[PDB]
């Protein structure tokens, strides 16, 4: 009943709208298989899928702990700090998962038909899944650590190749294992939701099922918040140091309430782009926070001199129209400071170099404007499912687990601007990583699911 499968490549039946509980020997021997409703059947199948899935996940965790964390040859290529960050508290995450699995196994063993699993769900989501928060909070660090190690450490690469060629990995890369606790936990509220769907015939148990859905959704949210707070806080301190407000009215950068939305260098335009040259082109670095746009000129890789700023309440952006009838300026747009750092108005004409940069800038700059558009008519939006998991590389991008359902808000030049079904998180990510959902059955059910998961 326990033949291993790596969770990386399993997709639960509980998520949408080869061993089964119907085929279990003790059920095929209790003969209760004819005397039961078509619905109590699907409820027992859901409880069993949570146990089967958690088993595959726990197995995949222990593969990660024995082949790569405990590798002496891998740890020899690193610092003790690099190792700490690369693996985080995966031991504590695993220990939690197994205590969770042991409680679930007990129930399945005691009765052919489980009364309920809802109490275990809620208990563990409130009092034992804290290591998940910590793991999710330090993803920023592990990814960062995994990057430099991948870029600047050849011994690391070689030893990693060799660990990955081993059989227990299944040829899957180390990263596929590190992101496993995030994948698992973000699927848990969906499975607990399936359990709620199949506990409607019963009044008292549906109570506990909804209890547990609330608790597990709070846990996943606490994880998402830990991740955001970690990145946003270090970003604000780092940028506060790097930005020079010497030559403008001082603006204090540090808030509990502030974070970065997008950043990048853009080329400066004159009103008349006609004598423009394509060499020694003037530049403008922009830091757009959630409440303020800051215009700077990059003097160093780690020093930016501030030239202007404006609360985003007072910033307008427009794509610029190509000149009327010769080769003219690529991908232009205009930024209007309505009330800038000196109370005046101001215009900045910029050129990005991709259709997608301009799109991402104009989307970011209308962050305050676009609030209603996403919420008003959600069922109308195309749905898409992510095939490969994606870790976010910029402030505007989004981190996506496998099988995440994403409503699409925009599409330009190989990049999708989307809203995740489960949490409502938004951002950009490349088209390569997702496939269009086409069935109206799915789309509809997934939107109903969205509203029932949301508070």
Q: Which residues make beta-bridge pairs with 305?
A: 244, 297
CA-wise closest residue to 264 among 344, 172, 404, 365 = 365
CB atoms < 10 A from the CB of 243, how many? 19
Look up residue 68 and give its DSSP letter: I
Q: Are 441 and 379 in contact (CB under 8 A)?
A: no
For the chain, give every domain's residue range. Answer: 7-240, 241-366
In sign, the C-alpha dihedral spanning 48, 51, 57, 60 is negative
CB atoms < 10 A from the CB of 394, how many? 14
Two structure tokens written together for 272: 């008349």
Look up residue 35 and give its DSSP letter: S
Nearest-angstrom CA–CA distance, 310 and 335 = 11
Header resolution in angstroms:
3.0
Q: What is the DSSP string of 181-250?
A: HHHHHHHHHHHHHHHHHTT-S-HHHHHHHHHHHHHHHHHHHHHHHHHHHHHHHHHHHHHHHHEE-TTSS-
Nearest-angstrom CA–CA distance, 353 and 410 = 19
Q: In what order do the strands lie in the sheet with 303-311?
A: 243-244, 303-311, 292-300, 283-289, 260-268, 346-351, 332-337, 315-319
Angle in degrees, CA 426, 131, 95, rounded to 5:
130
Q: What is the CATH number of domain 7-240?
A: 1.20.900.10
- Buried residues in 364-381 as b, exposed as e (16+ CB within 10 A): bbebeeeeeebeeeeeeb
CATH class, domain 241-366, is mainly beta
Q: How many helices (H) and strands (E) does the chain have?
A: 15, 13
Look up residue 321 and give its DSSP letter: P
Experimental method: X-ray
**Distances from the Cα of 147 to the Cαs of 73, 74, 77, 82, 138, in angstroms?**
19, 15, 14, 11, 14
Two structure tokens written together for 333: 């747009």
Q: In what order do the strands lie in the sheet with 426-430?
A: 426-430, 415-420, 405-412, 383-386, 434-437
**HSE (side-chain half, CA atoms, 13 Å) at 422:** 28
Two structure tokens written together for 245: 């407000």
H-helix or E-strand spanning residue 385: strand 383-386
Q: Checking phi first, is residue 442 left (phi over 0); if not, alpha (psi -120 to 50) or beta?
A: alpha
Nearest-angstrom CA–CA distance, 114 and 44 = 7
Nearest-angstrom CA–CA distance, 165 and 398 = 30
Q: Which residues make beta-bridge pairs with 333?
A: 319, 350
CA-based R_g, the chain, Å: 26
Q: Checking phi first, is residue 424 left (phi over 0); if not, alpha (psi -120 to 50) or beta?
A: left
Nearest-angstrom CA–CA distance, 245 and 117 = 57
Q: Which residues make beta-bridge pairs with 306?
A: 296
Q: What is the DSSP string of 336-359?
A: EESS-TTSS-EEEEEE-SSHHHHH
Residue with structure tokens 């409680």? 103
């Amino acid at each position: 009943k326990d033949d291993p499968q790596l969770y990386q490549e399993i997709r639960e039946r509980g998520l949408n709208t080869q061993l089964t509980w119907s085929q279990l020997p003790e059920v095929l021997e209790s003969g209760v298989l004819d005397t039961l409703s078509t619905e109590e059947r699907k409820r027992q199948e859901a409880i069993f899928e949570i146990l089967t899935s958690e088993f595959s996940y726990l197995h995949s965790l222990s593969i990660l702990v024995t082949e790569f964390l405990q590798s002496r040859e891998l740890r020899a290529t690193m610092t003790q700090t690099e190792h700490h960050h690369l693996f985080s508290n995966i031991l504590d995450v695993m220990s939690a998962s197994q205590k969770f699995f042991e409680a679930l196994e007990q129930r399945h063993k005691a009765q052919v038909c489980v009364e309920d699993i809802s109490d275990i769900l809620e208990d563990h989501a409130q009092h034992h899944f804290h290591p998940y928060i910590a793991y999710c909070s330090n993803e920023v660090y592990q990814q960062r650590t995994l990057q430099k190690l991948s870029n600047s450490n050849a011994a690391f690469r070689d030893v990693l190749k060799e660990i990955e060629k081993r059989p227990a990995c299944g040829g899957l890369p180390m990263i596929s294992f590190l992101i496993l606790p995030m994948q698992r936990v973000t699927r848990l509220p969906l499975l607990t939701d399936t359990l709620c769907l199949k506990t409607q015939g019963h009044p008292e148990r549906y109570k506990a099922a909804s209890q547990a859905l609330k608790a597990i959704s709070k846990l996943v949210k606490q994880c998402n918040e830990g991740a955001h707070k970690m990145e946003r806080t270090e970003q604000i301190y780092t940028l506060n140091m790097q930005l020079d407000f010497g030559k403008v009215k001082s603006l204090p950068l540090i808030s509990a309430s502030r974070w970065l939305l997008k950043r990048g260098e853009l080329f400066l335009l004159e009103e008349s782009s006609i004598f423009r040259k394509i060499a020694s082109r003037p530049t403008c670095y922009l830091f757009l926070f959630n409440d303020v746009l800051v215009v700077t000129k990059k003097k160093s890789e780690e020093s930016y001199l501030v030239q202007d700023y404006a609360q985003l309440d007072h910033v307008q952006v427009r794509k610029l129209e190509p000149s009327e009838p010769s080769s003219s300026v690529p991908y232009p747009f205009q930024v209007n400071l309505l009330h800038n750092s000196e109370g005046r108005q101001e215009q900045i004409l910029l050129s990005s170099d991709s259709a997608s940069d301009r799109a991402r800038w104009i989307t970011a700059l209308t962050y305050k404007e676009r609030q209603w558009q996403g919420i008003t008519n959600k069922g109308e939006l195309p749905q898409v499912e992510v095939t490969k998991a994606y870790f976010a590389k910029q402030a505007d991008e989004i981190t996506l687990q496998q099988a995440d359902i994403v409503l699409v808000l925009q599409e330009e030049d190989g990049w999708l601007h989307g809203e995740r079904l489960r949490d409502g998180e938004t951002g950009w990510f490349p088209e390569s990583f997702a496939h269009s959902i086409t069935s109206r059955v799915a789309v509809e059910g997934n939107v109903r699911r969205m509203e029932r998961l949301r508070v």
